Structures are given as C-alpha cells and as structure tokens.
Amino acid sequence: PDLLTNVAENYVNQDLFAGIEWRIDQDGKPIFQGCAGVKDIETRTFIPKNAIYRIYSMTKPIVSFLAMMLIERGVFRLSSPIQNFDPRFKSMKVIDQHAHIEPATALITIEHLLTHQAGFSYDFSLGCPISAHYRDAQLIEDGGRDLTDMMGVLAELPLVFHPGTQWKYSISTDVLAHIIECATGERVDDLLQRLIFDPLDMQDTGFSLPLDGASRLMEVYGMRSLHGLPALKPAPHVLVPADLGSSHPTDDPDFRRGGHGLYSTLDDYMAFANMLLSGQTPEGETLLSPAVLKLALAPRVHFGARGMRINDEPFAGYSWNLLGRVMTDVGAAAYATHLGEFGWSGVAATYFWVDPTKNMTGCVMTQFLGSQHPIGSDMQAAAMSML
Amino acid sequence: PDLLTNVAENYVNQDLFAGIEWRIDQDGKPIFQGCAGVKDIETRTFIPKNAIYRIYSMTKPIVSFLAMMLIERGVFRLSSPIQNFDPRFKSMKVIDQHAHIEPATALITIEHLLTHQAGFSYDFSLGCPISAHYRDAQLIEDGGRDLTDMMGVLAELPLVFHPGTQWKYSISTDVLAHIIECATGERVDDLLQRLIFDPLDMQDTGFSLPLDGASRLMEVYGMRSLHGLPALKPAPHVLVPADLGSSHPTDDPDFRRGGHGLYSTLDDYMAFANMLLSGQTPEGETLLSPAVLKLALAPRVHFGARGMRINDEPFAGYSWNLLGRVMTDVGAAAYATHLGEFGWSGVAATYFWVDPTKNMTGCVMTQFLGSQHPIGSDMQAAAMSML
Numbered sequence: 062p063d064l065l066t067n068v069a070e071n072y073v074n075q076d077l078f079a080g081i082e083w084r085i086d087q088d089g090k091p092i093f094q095g096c097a098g099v100k101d102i103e104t105r106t107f108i109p110k111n112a113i114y115r116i117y118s119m120t121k122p123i124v125s126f127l128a129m130m131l132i133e134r135g136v137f138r139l140s141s142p143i144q145n146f147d148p149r150f151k152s153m154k155v156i157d158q159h160a161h162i163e164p165a166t167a168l169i170t171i172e173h174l175l176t177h178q179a180g181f182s183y184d185f186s187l188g189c190p191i192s193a194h195y196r197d198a199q200l201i202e203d204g205g206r207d208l209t210d211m212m213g214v215l216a217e218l219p220l221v222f223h224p225g226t227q228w229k230y231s232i233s234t235d236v237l238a239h240i241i242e243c244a245t246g247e248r249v250d251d252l253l254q255r256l257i258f259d260p261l262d263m264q265d266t267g268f269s270l271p272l273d274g275a276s277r278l279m280e281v282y283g284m285r286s287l288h289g290l291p292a293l294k295p296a297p298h299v300l301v302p303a304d305l306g307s308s309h310p311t312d313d314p315d316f317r318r319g320g321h322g323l324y325s326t327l328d329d330y331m332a333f334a335n336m337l338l339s340g341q342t343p344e345g346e347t348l349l350s351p352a353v354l355k356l357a358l359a360p361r362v363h364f365g366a367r368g369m370r371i372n373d374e375p376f377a378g379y380s381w382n383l384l385g386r387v388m389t390d391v392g393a394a395a396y397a398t399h400l401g402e403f404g405w406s407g408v409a410a411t412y413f414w415v416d417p418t419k420n421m422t423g424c425v426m427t428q429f430l431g432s433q434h435p436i437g438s439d440m441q442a443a444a445m446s447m448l
Numbered sequence: 449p450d451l452l453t454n455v456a457e458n459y460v461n462q463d464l465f466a467g468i469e470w471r472i473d474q475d476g477k478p479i480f481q482g483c484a485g486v487k488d489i490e491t492r493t494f495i496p497k498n499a500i501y502r503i504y505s506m507t508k509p510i511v512s513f514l515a516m517m518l519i520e521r522g523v524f525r526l527s528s529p530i531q532n533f534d535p536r537f538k539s540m541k542v543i544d545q546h547a548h549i550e551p552a553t554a555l556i557t558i559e560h561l562l563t564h565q566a567g568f569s570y571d572f573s574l575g576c577p578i579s580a581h582y583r584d585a586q587l588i589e590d591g592g593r594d595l596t597d598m599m600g601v602l603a604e605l606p607l608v609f610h611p612g613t614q615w616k617y618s619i620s621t622d623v624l625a626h627i628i629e630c631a632t633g634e635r636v637d638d639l640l641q642r643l644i645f646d647p648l649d650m651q652d653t654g655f656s657l658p659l660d661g662a663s664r665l666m667e668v669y670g671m672r673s674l675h676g677l678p679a680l681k682p683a684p685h686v687l688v689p690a691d692l693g694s695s696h697p698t699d700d701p702d703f704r705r706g707g708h709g710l711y712s713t714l715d716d717y718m719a720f721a722n723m724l725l726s727g728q729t730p731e732g733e734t735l736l737s738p739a740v741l742k743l744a745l746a747p748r749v750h751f752g753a754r755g756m757r758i759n760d761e762p763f764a765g766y767s768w769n770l771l772g773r774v775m776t777d778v779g780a781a782a783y784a785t786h787l788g789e790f791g792w793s794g795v796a797a798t799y800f801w802v803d804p805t806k807n808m809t810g811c812v813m814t815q816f817l818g819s820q821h822p823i824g825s826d827m828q829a830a831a832m833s834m835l
C-alpha cells in the first residue's frame with residue numbers, strides 16, 4: 062500500500078507538520094508523489110503550485126558539487142591549502158575543552174572543508190569549546206552581513222581540533238563558498254546559477270525569492286532557542302510559526318552562503334538529485350565526469366563505534382563523502398536503505414536521498430525547525446518498502 | 449691506598465692522557481690532591497702552577513647558577529617565555545625524523561632552557577633530525593661570531609620536539625646566556641665576573657686567557673671529526689694534539705657562550721664547587737639563598753627505562769636539576785656515589801662533583817676530547833672509596 066501517503070497524512074493529522082510534499086523518481090521519472098496538509102495552519106491556505114521551502118543544509122550538497130566541478134576544471138584541488146586563496150586563514154589556532162590554545166599543526170585544505178574535518182564548529186553546537194564565541198560574533202544570526210565579511214570574523218577564532226584529525230559538522234561549507242569566490246573572482250550565487258541551476262532548469266532555486274515567490278513560500282514552524290543558546294533538551298514539538306530573526310532574508314540581493322540559505326522547490330531539488338545518479342543533465346550534458354563523481358561519492362570519513370553524530374544525534378551506518386552522508390553498512394542502519402544510498406537534509410526537516418542500487422531518488426519538503434520526529438527518514442523507509 | 453693516584457698514573461702510563469690534576473675537599477678544605485703526567489707530551493713540560501683548562505660544558509653549571517641568581521633578584525622567572533626578551537624566538541617550528549615540520553605548540557621558557565627541554569639540539573648530535581643544519585650554520589664551529597649574532601641564526605631553525613615534552617642535551621645554555629644579556633642589558637661575561645668569579649676569587653676563570661696565561665694553558669689532545677660530521681664509532685684514543693679550528697679562541701675579547709668556552713683552573717673550579725654546598729662564599733657572603741639553591745638542586749627531569757643519555761652514552765641513576773646531573777638512585781648507579789651527588793663535566797674530560805652527604809667536592813682536570821675512558825667517573829669512584 063501507499064506507505065508514503067500514510068506517513069505524511071498521519072504527521073499532518075497529528076498536528077506535527079503543517080504541510081508536506083514528496084516525490085520519488087526511478088530511472089528519472091516520477092513513480093510516487095503526493096502532498097498533505099496546507100501552506101500555513103493560520104489561514105489553511107492550500108499548498109501552492111511549486112511551493113518554496115527553506116532547504117537549509119540541503120544547500121551543502123549543491124555547494125559541494127560546485128566545488129567538485131571547479132576541481133575538475135582545475136581551479137583548485139582537494140589538497141589545496143585554503144590560505145593560498147585567503148591569507149586571513151593563515152596561522153590558525155586550536156582551542157580545547159580545558160581552555161588550552163595552541164597553533165594549528167596542519168593547514169586547512171579544500172578536502173578538509175568538504176569533509177568537515179577542518180576543525181570549524183557551528184554557532185548552535187551544544188557543549189562546544191568555541192560555539193559561544195561564534196554566537197557572540199553572530200556568524201549565523203547576522204544574515205545581512207556579507208559572506209566575505211563574516212568570513213573575516215570567523216577566521217580570527219580558533220578551531221576545535223587540528224585540521225584533518227577529527228570530524229565535526231560545521232560552518233566549513235560556508236568557508237568553502239567563500240574560498241570558491243576567492244579562487245574564481247566570482248560570486249558563489251552566480252556560479253551556482255550558471256553551472257548548476259540553469260543547466261538543470263532549477264528556475265526557483267536561489268538565495269532570494271523569485272519575483273512571484275512570496276505567495277508560494279511555505280510557512281516555517283518551530284521554536285528557535287532564546288539568544289541562540291543551545292538547548293539542553295528538546296523544546297515541545299508545537300506548530301507555532303518560527304521567528305528567523307535576520308538569519309534568512311527573502312529579498313537580500315547579496316545574501317549568499319555555503320551551508321544554508323537556499324530557497325528551492327520539490328521539483329527543482331529532484332532535478333539536482335536525479336542528476337547525481339549520472340553527473341549529467343537529462344539532455345546528456347556533463348556537469349561532472351563519472352570519475353570525479355565517483356571520487357565525490359566514495360566513502361571518505363569513517364566513524365568509530367560511536368558513529369557519525371551531530372549534536373549527539375546519530376546517523377547509524379552512515380559514513381561521509383565529499384557531498385554528505387553515504388550508507389556503508391545496512392546491518393548498522395536504523396531505517397530502510399541500501400548500500401551506497403547518499404544525500405543530506407536540513408534543519409527545517411527537508412530531506413533527500415539518492416539510491417544507486419534502485420536508480421532511485423526521493424525528496425520530502427516540509428518546514429519544521431528542530432523536529433522531534435524524523436519525517437525524512439520515515440518517508441525514505443516508506444519508499445524503500447514500496448520499491 | 450691512594451686509589452686516585454693509581455688511576456691517574458695508570459692513565460698517564462698507558463698513554464691515554466697527557467696530564468691530570470685532581471683535588472677533593474671535605475668541609476671546604478683539601479683532603480686528597482695530586483697530579484700526574486705533563487702539560488704536553490711534545491716537550492714534556494711539567495704541569496705548571498695554576499694550569500689552565502678548557503672546561504667546555506662545566507661552563508653550564510656556572511651560567512645556570514648565574515640564571516638562578518637573576519631569578520632570585522627578580523630579573524625573570526622559570527616560567528618566563530624567552531620570546532619576551534628576544535622576539536626572534538617567537539613562532540618556533542618543530543621538525544621530526546620523517547621530514548614533517550609544524551609550529552611549536554608551547555613557548556620556550558627559562559626553565560626549558562635550564563632543563564634542556566626546550567627542543568634545541570647540538571651541532572655534534574649523531575642521528576639528530578636538525579643537527580646537519582646546525583653544522584651547515586657553523587653554530588659551534590664559528591667561535592668568532594658574536595653570541596647575539598649566533599642566536600639570530602639559531603632562532604630561524606626548527607626545534608626537534610615541542611618545548612617541555614622531551615629532554616635532549618642541547619645548545620639551550622647558550623640561548624640562556626643570550627637571554628640573560630637581553631634581560632639585563634649586560635654581557636654574560638661581565639655578569640659572571642661581578643656576581644660569581646670576583647666574590648669567589650676565581651681570578652683565572654673567563655672566556656679569554658689572562659695576560660700571563662699562554663704558558664699555563666694545558667695542551668688538548670684527541671680527534672675532532674672532519675667537517676664536524678658526527679662519528680659512527682669512536683676514533684682511536686691516541687694522544688695527538690687536537691685542532692680546535694676557530695671554535696675556542698684564546699684572546700677574543702668578545703667571545704662568550706653559555707654552554708662552553710670558559711678557561712679555568714683546578715683551584716678556581718673547586719671554589720665554585722665548594723660554594724654549591726651552601727650558596728655562600730667561604731667568608732659567608734650569600735650568592736644564592738638556601739631556598740633557591742634547593743629549588744635549583746631538586747631533581748626536576750626524570751628518565752624512563754633507557755635513562756638519561758647524551759649521544760646514547762648513559763648517566764646511570766642520574767636525574768637532571770637546573771644545574772646539571774643529580775644522583776637519584778644509587779641502586780641504578782654505575783660507579784660509587786651517594787644520593788644527591790651532583791655536578792657536570794666537559795667534552796675534554798674535565799669532571800666535578802658535589803656530595804652533600806659527605807660535605808665533599810671533587811674535580812679532575814685534564815684535556816682529551818671524546819675520551820673512550822671515563823676518567824672523571826673513575827676518579828670520583830676512587831675518592832668515594834677512600835672516605
């Protein structure tokens with residue numbers, strides 16, 4: 062039966078999500094799709110055609126893919142030290158949980174940024190030795206700050222381990238977007254437009270709403286913590302509209318980031334996901350050669366018995382490649398999948414996957430910040446059970 | 449029986465040493481003393497009255513004692529970073545045996561210099577990752593270069609471990625002499641004269657010969673390796689005059705060092721050794737307080753299974769304090785001693801000890817570079833056996 066509809070309708074009928082859309086493609090054509098709920102519970106307006114979602118860290122596979130294209134074109138290489146493009150990242154320091162600070166003993170490379178092994182942290186990282194200083198600097202909160210300037214502020218702060226020696230999910234994709242700009246002399250949003258969005262016909266994807274976009278933007282629900290102080294336990298899961306402060310502008314022509322900030326649609330993101338099965342547009346144009354796509358997807362960071370964790374949340378059986386998660390042990394997995402399934406997700410509960418063993422892609426779009434309910438994994442599992 | 453004479457005479461009669469003097473004091477007055485052999489085997493001139501010896505690293509306890517006086521007087525402290533006095537030692541790097549170089553993760557302190565834990569090495573260190581670059585720079589060989597200038601060259605080279613983390617006998621006492629000059633605005637030789645030599649009436653001790661000193665200087669025998677390349681096995685122990693090149697001038701008024709370079713006499717060095725029993729001159733003037741002398745003599749570096757070693761030669765049962773060796777386990781010792789016996793020695797086979805349990809001091813003066821025979825320890829053992 063249609064387990065995907067069941068999952069989505071149950072979430073809407075339990076007042077856990079306002080509105081959900083999903084699509085599963087196989088061999089580049091839709092095989093399951095649906096929608097549940099509404100654009101916003103306040104007016105119960107129906108989900109519009111080509112509804113728009115804040116995809117947060119589903120920005121990261123796109124920016125990472127751009128970096129792989131630029132590696133293929135010779136702009137830089139995985140081993141390139143980022144200080145060669147921005148000397149503000151020369152002479153980094155490292156801080157630990159015992160207040161000890163010392164010089165970094167390795168240079169940060171492009172590969173370190175793509176694997177979150179550079180030693181950067183994130184503003185909302187609970188218990189982190191440096192996240193308090195990120196929050197004081199408002200690195201994430203101040204979305205009106207130009208990327209180039211935010212990077213100058215970040216560069217003055219210490220790392221939390223020596224580059225290459227550990228893994229911690231981080232602001233490093235934003236550093237990557239910035240280093241792309243340094244290396245090319247172009248803006249990351251223009252490069253994304255020319256190299257990825259326009260060839261794949263992702264006309265609704267970008268760091269600002271399209272002209273007719275305000276009426277299609279889905280409402281975002283959830284509770285962002287006071288002052289950005291990382292919470293010690295989950296807030297109650299309640300459909301209250303979320304206040305984004307100045308972190309996620311809708312119409313700032315200079316807003317651009319590497320780790321979040323894109324708006325997109327279900328249809329646009331599926332075009333990107335389907336492309337990742339081959340590296341080609343549907344017309345057959347190559348965005349990334351098979352050899353470099355294989356380089357990008359191969360498991361690259363392997364985890365100990367604790368596994369891959371973000372703020373202590375597990376990604377069971379997943380390793381990390383240059384674009385995001387990749388399933389490397391079905392026997393350790395916590396929900397239905399196949400070896401080699403890859404993809405990523407965002408904090409407003411958007412989720413996608415690519416499953417090469419089934420020539421399958423899937424994406425769930427919704428807007429709930431810090432959900433206590435893993436809707437993305439639930440929908441993936443339903444789709445796996447159906448195919 | 450006079451074991452000391454028997455040892456010394458056997459060494460002279462076996463053509464191993466040209467000339468030997470010794471004196472052992474108890475309670476500040478001589479109990480055993482003697483001489484054997486000649487000033488030089490070429491003319492067989494007898495050892496002159498107030499014969500002069502190149503004491504090499506028996507310079508180090510003198511310069512270290514000076515540093516303790518300056519600590520007592522508030523000039524600097526054990527924890528003082530040396531870069532505060534000479535910024536050429538900011539931003540040190542560390543090299544390892546696998547060609548890897550990285551920034552030092554700790555600042556070098558005065559204490560590190562006094563304990564040879566700063567990470568410096570020495571030109572003649574066999575197998576050392578950096579000693580080839582010391583030799584290329586001629587740090588030891590170029591005795592005509594001003595101390596201040598040698599330090600500038602040394603400061604550009606990497607350490608061989610992070611400061612504080614290991615022990616390696618080193619050029620750090622020369623760094624200490626230079627930092628003393630930076631901290632005080634005075635020259636180390638003027639400070640030694642005023643603070644130590646003049647109070648102890650050590651009128652023949654200094655970095656150049658007295659005006660009547662040339663005829664009193666003992667000839668120096670042995671083989672220095674060609675180009676300074678550290679030898680893979682001992683050279684034959686043969687009494688041939690040694691060529692010191694420009695490493696050890698006799699009449700350069702600006703030659704001064706921390707780790708070697710002093711000329712002295714048996715009588716002068718015994719005045720210094722006897723003072724180390726109390727921190728006082730024989731007239732009762734305090735050069736160093738009892739509390740700071742105890743701080744200087746307390747065992748400070750402890751060694752693992754292989755023990756304290758220099759170029760793989762062992763100092764069995766010895767630990768390191770701020771002035772040199774200190775006996776911390778008679779059950780591990782390789783020759784007669786008592787708990788707390790301390791002192792040092794030099795590469796031309798001069799040797800001294802202070803034994804607080806016996807209120808005893810002893811010194812052996814001779815001139816043979818890189819002796820295969822441990823004459824100093826043999827004479828200490830003889831004297832211990834005669835009490």
Ligand SMILES: CCOC(=O)[C@@H](C)c1cccc(C(=O)c2ccccc2)c1
Pocket residue numbers: 116117118119185201284285286308320321406407408409430431
């Ligand atoms: C998936 C992408 O989200 C991120 O990981 C970073 C980029 C991010 C960026 C901007 C805003 C937020 C939050 O609003 C938030 C974070 C943690 C808990 C509750 C809310 C998070």
Ligand SMILES: CCOC(=O)[C@@H](C)c1cccc(C(=O)c2ccccc2)c1
Pocket residue numbers: 503504505506572588671672673695707708793794795796817818
């Ligand atoms: C005790 C003080 O030894 C030193 O610190 C330096 C000043 C030194 C200076 C000049 C010559 C030598 C050697 O002749 C030698 C070194 C190693 C092996 C064999 C011979 C050593």
